[model samples]
Target: SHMPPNRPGITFEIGARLEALDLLQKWYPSRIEKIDYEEGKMLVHFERWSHRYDEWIYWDSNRLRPLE
Candidate 1:
């Protein structure tokens, strides 16, 4: 009980601003719309795009990044 639970190293919040890589290998501005903890994935809401284009990506996927 002293140690923390094992989980993905990368952490994100519900409304965190992030950049996601699209299928075309392009980076696009996105927001964390929702997080499926059980699935260990997050819903990426792309900027300037409809919700229809949103997608679910794993928390540790290399396709996600901060505003850097």
Candidate 2:
């Protein structure tokens, strides 16, 4: 079966590096802290940032991207 199932932004992995777009239209280096499968969202922690900045973004959001 070559068909692909509905997938999240790239292969999501805890501690994996990723880029997340912010409300200010800026992309920040982030890491996956936790994934909420039931909520279909991921908890992201921006590198060198405080815990207050952690956010949960939709799994299918275009704002989530693989770290290049």
Candidate 3:
């Protein structure tokens, strides 16, 4: 069977990226002026340090669960 041109080969990666973005937004909706990913790393316009924001002291994007 031939795959459609509009269809993606690996959907999970995109899902992960979207999930990462969603979580990032929920965490810093107002402070996050801009955000994007490059070469598997997330970049932000306004940076947040865990030391300053005690809430995100243990935040690790790689550890984010899909439904958690």
Candidate 4:
């Protein structure tokens, strides 16, 4: 059977990329959530080094600037 002209094949690499993005969003909604005026950029949180690793990651505009 021939695939439709409008329909394209789903390559394995493309699938992996899509899956990675999905997982990122799920794990870090605040960091990976999409915002207006930004298409391919996401807000990430950075934290200081700690042994307990219970500190909340701070949101810095500078961190997102490079993305632009």
After best superposition, candidate 2 residue 25: deviation in angstroms? Answer: 1.5
User: How would you encode candidate 2's per-residue C-alpha lDDT over 1-68 as one tens digit per residue?
Assistant: 22222554466768877898877778988998998777778898888879898989987788787777
lDDT of 4 by residue, 1-68 (tens): 12211212211111111111222332211222222232322223322223232222212222221211
RMSD of each: 4.5, 4.3, 10.9, 14.5
Q: lDDT by residue for model 3 over 1-68, one digit each (tens)?
A: 12212223212222222222333445332122222332232232222444233222112344222322
If the candidates were sorted by their TM-score against the true structure, best first, what order would they fall in?
2, 1, 3, 4
Report the number of the highest-lDDT candidate.
Answer: 2
Once model 4 is optimally superposed onto the true structure by TM-score, how far is the C-alpha of residue 2 displaced, in angstroms?
A: 26
What TM value does model 1 have? 0.78
TM-score of each: 0.78, 0.79, 0.18, 0.17
**How many residue pairs of model 4 clash at the backbone?**
0
Pairs of residues at least 3 apart in sequence or in different chains that clash in candidate 4: none
What is the overall TM-score of model 2 with all chains considered together? Answer: 0.79
Runs of candidate 2 with Cα error greater than 4 angstroms are: 1-9
Whole-model lDDT per candidate: 0.77, 0.78, 0.27, 0.22
- Clashes (backbone N, CA, C under 3 Å), per candidate, total 0, 0, 0, 0
Residue pairs in candidate 3 whose N, alpha carbon or C atoms collide under 3 angstroms: none
**Which has the better TM-score: candidate 1, or candidate 4?**
1
